[PDB]
Nucleic acid binder design. Structure first.
Length: 75
DNA sequence: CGCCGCGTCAGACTCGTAGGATTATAGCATACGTGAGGTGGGATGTCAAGGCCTTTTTTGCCTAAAATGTGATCTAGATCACATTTTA
């Protein structure tokens, strides 16, 4: 999709969550959605609420978590 | 009074078309200011690490306390080929 290929700062993320993302080598939103929730919760600084509001904003702009890709990355 | 001469003053309306100018003019010296150039220097703006507080993420922990396991003893369901037997 045209929205697979965006950096996450178009979502206007937060500093703690941003540190969580850059800390975990998660580059593309296609790389985001291929990651699973429990693969996030165990990670540093990602407990209750990061998952809450990131779930909110992805509920806003029409996508969800944990989805599955194929032919990734086209780069 | 009544010419005559001279002078003043208007001459329809909307569109289109082209580019366009020219002569010759003394010369050098003095001395002064202003434009374009340097130039250190306050001062502002940036970028990378640290101390105040609350919130957040782990994470102790606290005791109610319901749940998860132990296994031998049963139980009330469940079958199948033969013998009719009923109903549309």
């Amino acid at each position: 999709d045209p929205i697979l290929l965006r950096p996450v700062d178009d979502l206007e993320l937060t500093v703690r969550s941003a540190n969580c993302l850059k800390a975990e080598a998660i580059h593309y939103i296609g790389d985001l959605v291929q990651r699973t929730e429990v693969e996030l919760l165990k990670t540093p600084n990602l407990g209750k609420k990061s998952l809450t509001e990131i779930k909110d904003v992805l509920a806003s702009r029409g996508l969800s978590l944990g989805m599955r890709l194929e032919n990734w990355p086209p780069a």
